[PDB]
Structure formats: structure tokens, C-alpha cells
Design a protein around this ligand. Structure first.
Ligand code: HEM
Length: 137
């Protein structure tokens, strides 16, 4: 289930983090508008841009902590506050986060692996709700 999925992703977190974030950017090309430097790049090129590899690994390092600190796929309000408050996310709305989790769930659904994709779907919705409550637009 969800807690085992955290251990699976953490066991190869660099590859999962890149493959899910690329799934997100290819499913929602307009989302590259928050990045700029990513435009007109193939997946293999993106993987070779330092701010892609670094920022994608740090997204997934923190997302796995937030998942790990969750009860029944409900994140801590403190984790939502922390995320909202991040100066680098000034641009963002809950819409950016919803789309990332739609792509994550779709990626898990298409994998050959026994991920608990319905738990991730609820995690993504609960995190979007928590971010809104914590002040994200
Ligand atoms: C659980 C989800 C996410 C987490 C944990 C997260 C985490 C982070 C972290 C830790 C940083 C700082 C890392 C660093 O720059 O060294 C960062 C920067 C940034 N995040 Fe996020 N982020 C998340 C989702 C998103 C989403 C959905 C977007 C846009 C759709 C986004 C856009 C950005 C941007 C634009 C930056 C800085 C600009 C750059 O990449 O050069 N983040 N994020």
C-alpha cells in the first residue's frame, strides 16, 4: 500500500522522480511556463539540465517526507504551510499540484508494479485541500 510505495519510490528515487516529473511536463505542456529553461527540450536533454535533475530530486525527497508524515493519506497541516510559504512557489496555484498528482497516479497505473494508485490519488487531493487551507491560491 501507500507506505510500501514510499519505500519503493525511495529505493530508486532519482529515476522515479525524473520519470514522473517528465510524465507531468509531457501531459501538461503549458506547465513548462513556470520553468522557461525547459522549453524546446526532449526528455533526455531535460535530464541533462542541472536545475532539472536537482529540483526534481528535491521535489520527490520532500514529497516522500510529506507522504511519510501523513496519516491515511492526509498530510500534516505544517507540511502544507511549509510548502505554501516557499518563496520559489510564489507563482503557483493548487492547479499546478493537482496536475502533478494526476500524472503521478497515471504513471503508477501504467507501471507494471503493484503501486496503491488510489492511495496516491487521495494523497494528491488531500494535499491540494491542505495547501488551500494553508493559504495557497
Ligand atoms: C510536492 C510537490 C513539490 C515539492 C515538494 C516542491 C519542492 C520544491 C523544492 C524543495 C524546491 C527547492 C529545491 C531547490 O531549488 O533547490 C522547489 C523549487 C521550485 N518549484 Fe517546486 N515543488 C513541488 C511542486 C512544484 C510544482 C507542481 C511546480 C510547478 C508546476 C513547482 C515549481 C517550482 C519552481 C518553478 C521552483 C524554482 C524554479 C526552478 O526550478 O529553477 N514545484 N520546489
Amino acid at each position: 500500500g501507500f507506505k510500501q510505495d514510499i519505500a519503493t519510490l525511495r529505493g530508486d528515487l532519482r529515476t522515479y522522480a525524473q520519470d514522473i516529473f517528465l510524465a507531468f511536463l509531457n501531459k501538461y505542456p503549458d506547465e513548462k511556463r513556470n520553468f522557461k529553461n525547459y522549453v524546446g527540450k526532449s526528455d533526455q536533454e531535460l535530464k541533462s539540465m542541472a536545475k532539472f535533475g536537482d529540483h526534481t530530486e528535491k521535489v520527490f525527497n520532500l514529497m516522500m517526507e510529506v507522504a511519510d508524515r501523513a496519516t491515511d493519506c492526509v498530510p500534516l497541516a505544517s507540511d502544507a504551510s511549509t510548502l505554501v510559504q516557499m518563496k520559489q512557489h510564489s507563482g503557483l496555484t493548487t492547479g499546478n499540484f493537482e496536475k502533478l498528482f494526476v500524472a503521478l497516479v497515471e504513471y503508477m497505473r501504467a507501471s507494471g508494479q503493484s503501486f496503491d494508485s488510489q492511495s496516491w490519488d487521495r494523497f494528491g487531493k488531500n494535499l491540494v485541500s491542505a495547501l488551500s487551507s494553508a493559504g495557497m491560491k
